[PDB]
C-alpha cells in the first residue's frame, strides 16, 4: 500500500542546445537518449520556465512543442532540462473546490495541490471487458434532453452548439439540475446525490469563465468542482493538455475514490484548433479541413475516458461543449465527435433566433444509449414510445412547414396541419424551458402526453396500442 | 438582508475557529513527524544512484 | 536485433533492422510493445507500434519475430472476447487484476491451461497428410461440439506419430508429420497471418439464404450464406436489430462480431448483451456466446489495432469456415476501419486520393470482402463452409458521397442502404427500399422454386407497387390526392399499408422479433392479394372510397397479420394465413356486387 | 375554376421566378464556389506536402 518507491532522486539532464524554434514547437539537438513523451522545463533567457513536451524524437533531435507559447525563446541562452517522465499531474482529493489554470498550476490563492499520487495525464485504456454498461439515467431537468435524449450516468454526450448560442447556459443548467431519476435515497448522505463536477474551460472568453464560476458559487457546486480554466488570453498549446488534465483528475475522482463526477469540457472546438496548430507546425499530412489526420484518435483519447467500471462505484459522465463552426455538423470537429461520443445534444441557431430556450433541436440530437435507461423500473413506462412519437411528429411538422413554404396550404392534408400545430406547441411549450425550471422527467412526460393528445388515437401510430389505451385518455 | 449582512463577523469567526482546530492538528502532526520525515528524506537525497541509461 | 531511431506516435522508425520483411511483427521497447514494419529503408524500418508509444527512447531494443501479424487459431477462441491483436481481454483482467490493459501484455490468445477432450480422427501413422486435413476433433462447447481441429494450410507431409484420444492442453504435441527429413511438430493450435486469406480448394456459389429476420431484408433484398452486405449502421434499428437477429436465429453455426472503432460504452453494452441471448435459440437454450467470438476494439485503442481488428475477425471467420460451419462475420462499422486506414496513411505520409482517404481503399475493402465465399475446405474430408460478411457502414454526415460507401458499393452483392426520412419518422427498420439492392435475388431462385415458388413473383410485385407509389407520391405531395384515379389511390394506399405493416418491423416484441421466412412469404401473399383484389374490384364498377369503408375489416386483418406469433409454427400460422386470404377473397367478392 | 387557375398560374409563376431561380444559385454556390474552393485548398495542402 506504501508508495515509498518514490523516495529516489534522478538528476535531470539540462541542455543548452536549442537548434531552432518555429511556431509553437522548439526543436532541440544533441539530446542523449530522448524519451518520446517526456516533458521539458525549458528556461527562457529571462529566467522564466516554460513547460514543453517532447513531440517526436529522432536520433539526437527532439521536436518539442512548448506550452505557454514560444514567444521570447531563443538559441544562445535557452536551457531545456529534461524531466525523465511523461506529464504527471499531482492529483489529490483536495483539489475538489478550487480553480486550476489550464496546465495544472492553481490560480486559486491556495498552494500547490498536496498530491497523494501522480497520475499520467494520458491515463490508460480501460479494459473493455472490465467496463460496465451505463444504465442509470440522470435527470438533467432539461425536458428537451431527459425525454428524448436522456443522458445516462457514464454516457458521453457533447452539447454541439453554434458560435454565439447559449450552450454555456445549458451546461450550467445541466450542472444545477443533474441527478439520477431514481436515486439511492432522499438524504444527501448515503445516496451521494451530488455529482462532483470537474469543469475544463479551454479557449473560452473570460466572461464565460466568470459565468461558470459564479453559477457554481450560486448553486453551491464550487465546493466540489475543479475548474480547469484556460482562458482566451491564456496560451494556445496549453489547450492540448487541459482536457487531459481534467479527465485524469476526473478518473482519479471517479474510479480511485468511488466519487460520481460530471466532466464538462467547454469549447472543445478550441481544442481541435490547438491540435490543428500543433500538427500544422509539424508539417504533418492534414486531414479533412487542415486538421491533423490523427484527430480521431487524439479526440477519442479525450472522450473515451468516460463511463462506469466493474467493481468501482464511480462513474465519469462528461458533456463536452463543442463550438461547431459555421453551424454545419459535417465540420470535422463535430463530425469526428459524432463518431466517438454516443449521441449529441444539438443546440440549434434558428430556434434560438425565435427565442426558444433551450434552443435544443430534437431531430439532430441523439443519445445512442438512451434506449437502455428508459422503460419500466427506471422512469415512466411509456418513455421510450413517447420519445419516438415526439421525434416522428416533430419531423412530420418540419416537413409540413417546408411544403407550406414551397406549396400553398391547400396541398397539406389534415395530418400536416395537425403536425404544424403540434410543432408550434412543441417548440413553444415543451422545448421552451426556464433557466431554472428543472422539469422532472415525469412531468416532462405528462407535458409530452398533453401535447400528443392533439392527434387522434388512431394517428399516434408509433405508440404501441397498449401504451395508447393506458395513457392517452387519462387526461 | 440586514440579518445576513451583520452575520459576516459571526460566520467568519466560526469558520476561523473551525479552521484553527484543523490547523493546530496539522501543526501537532508535523512537529512530531518531521524528524522521521527529514531522516528518510535526507537519506533519499544523499544516496547515489550511479547507473547508465543505455538500457 | 535492432534499435529505435525515431518515434512520432504509432510510427517508430527502427534501425539496424536489415533483413526484416515487410509487415513483420517486431517487438518494440523494453516493454516489448507489439509492432509491425510498414516501410523498409535500408537499415531502418518504419514500425507502427499498436500501442501507447509514450515512453519509448532511442536505443530501445527492437527484436524481430519473423512472423506476420498472426492470429492464434484453434480451440478455445469460441467463447472468448478478443482485442484487435487477438488479446484475450478477460484473461488480461484475470492475470492483471487491475482494470487497465498493461502496455505490452503477452497473455496467450488461447487459454493454455484448459484441457480439451480430443479424438484421433481419421489419419493414422505413416499416412500422408495435407494442409487443411482434419486430424482430430475437440469437444469445445455443447453448441460447437466437435470443433474439428485441422492441420495448418501450408504444411504437409507424412504422419509419423499421432496422439491417441484423451485430454490435452493447447501446447501438447498432438501430431508429428515428416516432410523431407525435417519432421514438423504440430500441436492443438496453429497461427496464421491475418493479412492473407486462408486458402480453400474451391469457392462455390452462395445459394442458400441467410434468414436475417427483418421482413424487408429477407423479402425485398435477400442475403445469402456466404454473401456480403452493408447494414446501415444507424442507431436504434437497422444495425442493432440485425446484429442480434443474425446472432440468435440466422442458423450460422459460428459467429464473429468484430467491432472496429465502436464507442466504448457500446461495446460495454455488447459485452453485457451477448452472454444473455439464449432466450429463443434452437436446441436446448444454450447461450450464443458459446457460438460467437467477438473482436472488441474500442475507438480509443491505437490506430493500427483498429486497422487489424477486422483482419483478425475475418481470419477467425475463415478458420470456422474451414471446418464446414456456416460462419457469419458481423464487421460492425467498417467505416471506422476505413478511417483507421486514412489516418495510418496520413501518419505514414503517402498521398491520399479521395477526401483524404488513401488511394488503395477500394483494393483494401475488396481484399477484406472477397474472403466471404462459400467454399469447400482445403483438405480431406471434403466439407462445405461459408463465411458471410455483414459490414456495417456508418454513413457519417453524407448519404453516399463518402468514399468508403462508394468504394464498398462496387463490391458488396447486398446493400441495405439507410433511409434518412424513415429514420426521422422513427420507422424501424429504416432501410431505403429504393436505393438498396441485392445481386442475390436471381441466384436464390434455385432455393425459392423448391420451397416458396411464388416468392420471387411476389417480391417483384411488392417492389413494383412501392416504386410506382413512390413516383405517385412525389406528385401527390406536390398537387394533392383529389385528381388521383381509383387505381392510383389503391396503389398509394396499399403502398402505405405495406410500408407501415410489412416493411416496418418492431424487432423487440415477442412477435415480429424474428419474422421467419414462411411468415414473411405468407404476409407478402396477403398484401399482394389484397392489392390485387382492390385493383380487380375497381376494374369493375365499385368505387374505392365505399370499398375501403366496407372492407376496413379486411384491411385491418391484413394489417394485423404481422401480430401472428411465429413460435406457433408454420403448421398453424400458415393455416391462419390461408383463412385470412380466403376470407379476404370472399369479402371482396361480396363487396364487388 | 377562375380562382383555381389564378392560384395554379401564380404558383407556377412563383416557382419559375423565385423558387427555381433561388435553388439554382444555391447549388451554383454550393458546388462551383465552395466545393471547388475547398478542393483547391486541399490540393494546395497536398502540394505543400509533396514539396
Portion of residues in beta strands of chain D equals under 5%
Protein chains sharing the most extensive interface: A-C, 76 and 68 residues
User: Could you give the order of strands across the largest sheet of chain C?
Assistant: 1-2-5-4-3-6
Order of helices and strands of chain D: H
**Biggest pleated sheet of chain C:** 6 strands, antiparallel
Percentage of helical residues of chain C?
25-40%
N→C terminal distance of chain C: 93 Å
Please provide the count of β strands of chain C: 23
For the record, give the distance between the C-alpha atoms at the N and C termini of chain D, rounded to a whole number: 70 Å
Shape of chain D: rod-shaped
The number of helical runs of chain D is 1
Q: How many runs of DSSP E, i.e. beta strands of chain D?
A: 0
Our Rg estimate of chain D from Cα atoms comes to: 21 Å
Largest sheet of chain D: none
Helix content of chain D: over 70%
- Structural class, judged by helices and strands of chain C? alpha+beta
Could you say how many structural domains of chain C there are in total?
4
Structural class of chain D: mainly alpha
Question: What would you report as the Rg of chain C, rounded to the nearest angstrom?
Answer: 27 Å
Protein name (chain C): V-type proton ATPase catalytic subunit A
EC number (chain C): 7.1.2.2
Keywords (chain C): ATP-binding, Hydrogen ion transport, Ion transport, Membrane, Nucleotide-binding, Translocase, Transport, Vacuole
Membrane topology (chain C): Peripheral membrane protein
List the helices and strands and how they pair.
This is part of a larger assembly, with chains A (475 residues), B (55 residues), C (593 residues) and D (51 residues).
Chain A lengths: L17 E5 L2 E5 L8 E6 L5 E10 L2 E6 L12 E8 L1 E4 L8 E2 L15 E4 L22 H4 L12 E3 L5 H11 L10 H4 L8 E5 L1 H14 L8 E4 L10 H15 L3 E4 L1 E2 L1 H14 L13 H9 L11 E4 L3 E2 L8 H9 L4 E3 L1 H5 L29 H24 L7 H16 L11 H12 L12 H7 L4
Parallel strand pairs in A: 8-12, 10-16, 10-17, 11-12, 11-14, 13-15
Antiparallel strand pairs in A: 1-2, 2-5, 3-4, 3-6, 4-5, 7-9
Helix pairs in contact in A: 2-4, 7-8, 10-11, 10-12, 11-12
Chain C lengths: L2 E5 L3 E5 L8 E5 L4 E9 L2 E5 L13 E7 L12 E2 L6 H7 L20 E4 L8 E2 L7 E2 L18 E6 L3 E3 L4 E6 L6 E3 L14 E2 L11 H5 L19 H10 L6 E8 L1 H10 L18 E7 L4 H19 L6 E5 L1 H15 L12 H9 L4 E3 L7 E3 L1 E2 L13 H7 L4 E2 L4 H5 L12 E2 L6 H7 L3 H22 L9 H16 L15 H23 L4 H7 L1 H9 L9 H23 L1
Parallel strand pairs in C: 7-17, 16-17, 16-18, 18-21
Antiparallel strand pairs in C: 1-2, 2-5, 3-4, 3-6, 4-5, 8-10, 8-12, 9-11, 11-13, 13-14, 15-19, 19-20, 22-23
Helix pairs in contact in C: 5-6, 11-12, 11-13, 12-13, 13-16
Chain D lengths: L1 H49 L1
